[PDB]
């Protein structure tokens, strides 16, 4: 679930936002894609 929403999240940024970082969005995209890493890493 949280793959979908990185790559799914991450997709929209690049390809939503048509930006390379969102200072509003991107952090939500990064920051959140990263939570889903983690959750993998220390968890699952």
Request: net charge positive; glycine share 10%; hydrophobic share 60%.
């Amino acid at each position: 679930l949280v793959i979908l929403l990185g790559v799914v999240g991450l997709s929209a940024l690049t390809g939503y936002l048509d930006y390379v970082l969102l200072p509003a969005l991107a952090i939500f995209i990064g920051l959140t894609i990263y939570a889903i890493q983690r959750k993998r890493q220390a968890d699952a």
